[model samples]
Target: GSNQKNSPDRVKRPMNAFMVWSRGQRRKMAQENPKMHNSEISKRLGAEWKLLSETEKRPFIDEAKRLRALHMKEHPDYKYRPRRKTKTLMKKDKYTL
Candidate 1:
């Protein structure tokens, strides 16, 4: 009789694809904005990542890396650019605009 009931011990562990994907995504996000952290990613995609399986994590990682690279290439000066102050008005604002 090969009829066997599933036991708790034999239960498979849930795969956390989101966590894996988030690791890669967060890395890129952090690279873009140094202030971003893992906590932020967890907050944003916690539920989604929790539902993901190992098989699904790879694609997300690849997509995140690709997007990050593209974004970096597009904004090479992003890190070097100084943040514009809203309070400060440029002398030539009218002419520039």
Candidate 2:
């Protein structure tokens, strides 16, 4: 019999190509617009990444692939298992109660 269990030994998923590219872009955008909100920057990053041509995206995509390859080699048996939570997650609900 096999039992599933959670542990601190979990391995995190590597960043996708867009996320890797956006991380560098985020720094530049944030530095240029010091007052820009995180949500706004997140939206802008997605828009910019979407507009990029496949040629422009190759480097980021290759880098992400390499990272995932390394991750798989390091943790071959890793599987993502997000924990479920049934508890009310919003503080607004508590405030309204």
Candidate 3:
């Protein structure tokens, strides 16, 4: 009789200090803002933001939105706005680079 173990020990990958810090920052932002978009969260976390691919970014965005909704259910005062901005053509304004 052969028996197979259904549960196998999982291995954890070691993350760099920066990655760990970035993850924590993202989590905190998710809890605080509750409505932060992926791009916004990425921006807040700084350098680590660029490491994420578009595919990766999509899921993060969705998760952030979901977490925000759940948090709002508990805190009625929670408010969120999609932080999209339109680019203005600066041709009219003169600025030296």
Model 2 CA deviation exceeding 4 Å by range: 1-11, 75-97
lDDT of each: 0.54, 0.74, 0.57
lDDT of 2 by residue, 42-97 (tens): 88999998798898789889888988888878876765567666422223212122
Please give the distance, in angstroms, between residue 61's alpha carbon in candidate 1 and its true position after superposition.
10
Q: Model 1 lDDT vs. the true structure?
A: 0.54
Q: TM per model?
A: 0.30, 0.63, 0.32
Q: What C-alpha lDDT does candidate 2 achieve relative to the native structure? A: 0.74
List clash counts for every candidate, in order. 1, 0, 0
Q: Model 1, 1-97: lDDT tens per residue? A: 6977552343223324354476666656656654444455457667666676767777766665665565556675555434445422223212222
**Candidate 3 residue-wise lDDT, 35-61, digit = tens:** 556666777777656675667566566
> What is the Cα-based lDDT of residue 51 in candidate 1?
72
